[PDB]
Amino acid sequence: NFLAEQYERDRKAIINCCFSRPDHTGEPPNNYITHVRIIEDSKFPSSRPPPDSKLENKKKRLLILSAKPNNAKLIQIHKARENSDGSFQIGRTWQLTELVRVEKDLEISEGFILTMSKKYYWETNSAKERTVFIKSLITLYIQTFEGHVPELVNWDLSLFYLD
Amino acid sequence: SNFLAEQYERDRKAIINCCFSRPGEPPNNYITHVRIIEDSKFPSSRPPPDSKLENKKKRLLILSAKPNNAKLIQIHKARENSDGSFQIGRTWQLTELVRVEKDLEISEGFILTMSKKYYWETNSAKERTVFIKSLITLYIQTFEGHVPELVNWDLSLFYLD
């Protein structure tokens, strides 16, 4: 539950850095939804990294999901990092609509791949965290559809339940 | 394939006519349905592959929404009468649904849990895929904003075509 305190800490900093005041363009900010810590391997950013990847390759980053202030159905994905001075900054943005595939790595419990125009391989810090972020990403995606339209989605799901 | 789609439009129209067009209060709005087989000797678990034809009853599952709130969903069980009319025999609130499980060995079978368990089969594997997709996506959509920690699943892959 060190996890939960870290999450709340990150959340506050993130909203403060990036989803709270007009930016400076002087455009309003997006509304924050959720985030997750990830590890990115700069030499293997699109596929499973060799077991022997130099610790120097491993970057600490964050994925963040948010929505347009005037559009609750226009969601964005961001990649961000925490700088040494504690500030936060976003380095990449995608529209959710660019997402075409989400897959868990069968061999690495924290590994997953997001596919937009290219593939993005990332790892979470734990198996549980992978489950949570992916659930968040996919349910949010589903919620952006306008009413009943399941013809366009495909999944390997066989069990769904409430705890 | 083409037969199915045509059967599906036929059923849909009849279902709306019989159950979602007249009023006590305004009728619900139809969303979707599927044809199911129910085993009356084995209603809550996988029937023996041996189960006699006389146990097998033709039904339908229908999803609908309250006219005022598209996020208040109901599940209905119905049956087509010999005369060609349809009638609803059972209703649940979608909020009652606590589990959805595909039968891992019978590709047409699935189980829904509300207070009791209900085992049903569709007529094909593809029809199961389609209805379950509708059921779960709708459940998800009845949530405003981020969906809570409580929902769980075994998904490991998701993609658009």
Inter-chain contacts counted by CB atoms under 8 A, chains A and B? 119
Distance separating alpha carbons of residues B87 and A21, to the nearest angstrom: 56
CB contact under 8 A, B100 and A139: no
Chain B residues with beta carbon closer than 8 angstroms to that of A99: 160
Q: Are the beta carbons of B153 and A160 separated by less than 8 Å?
A: yes
Q: Count CA atoms within 13 Å of residue A61 on its CB side.
A: 21
CA distances B76 to A24, A162, B19, B71, B102, Å, are 54, 21, 10, 16, 19
Q: Is residue A157 part of a domain?
A: no
Contact criterion met (CB below 8 Å) for B76 and B65: no
| DSSP assignment of A47-69 | SPPPTT--GGGEEEEEEEEEEET
Cβ neighbourhood burial of A134 (10 Å; 0-12, 13-18, 19+): buried
* Cross-chain Cβ contact B136/A106 below 8 Å: no
In angstroms, the CA B106 to CA B62 distance is 22
**Considering its fold, how many domains does chain A have in total?**
1
3-state secondary structure of A22: coil
DSSP SS3 for A35 = strand
Q: Whole domain around residue B121: which residue ranges?
A: 1-143
- Number of neighbours of residue B121 by Cβ within 10 angstroms: 21
Question: Is B161 part of any domain?
Answer: no
Residue B71 lies in a domain: yes
Q: In which residue are the tokens 């993005």 written? A: A120
A155 falls within a domain: no
Q: Is the CB of residue B146 less than 8 Å from the CB of residue A33?
A: yes
The reply to whether residue A161 touches residue B133, judged by beta carbons under 8 angstroms, is no
Chain A contact set for B149 (CB, 8 A): 132, 163
Please check whether residue A30 is in contact with residue A67, taking contact to mean a CB–CB distance below 8 angstroms: yes
For residues B2 and A135, what is the distance between their CA atoms, to the nearest angstrom?
A: 35
Is position A139 within any domain? yes
For position A5, which CATH number holds?
2.30.29.90
The contacts found for B3-7 with CB under 8 angstroms, 24 or more apart, are B4/B127, B7/B35
Query: For residue B29, is it within any domain?
Result: yes
Strands A111-115 and A119-123: antiparallel
Q: Which of A101, A148, A154 sits opposite B31 (nearest CB)?
A: A148
Show residues of chain B in contact with A157, CB under 8 Å: 102, 132, 136, 153-155
**Neighboring chain A residues of B155 at a CB cutoff of 8 Å:** 134-135, 138, 155-157
Does the residue B155 lie in any domain? no
Is residue B35 included in any domain, yes or no? yes
Beta bridge partners of B95: none
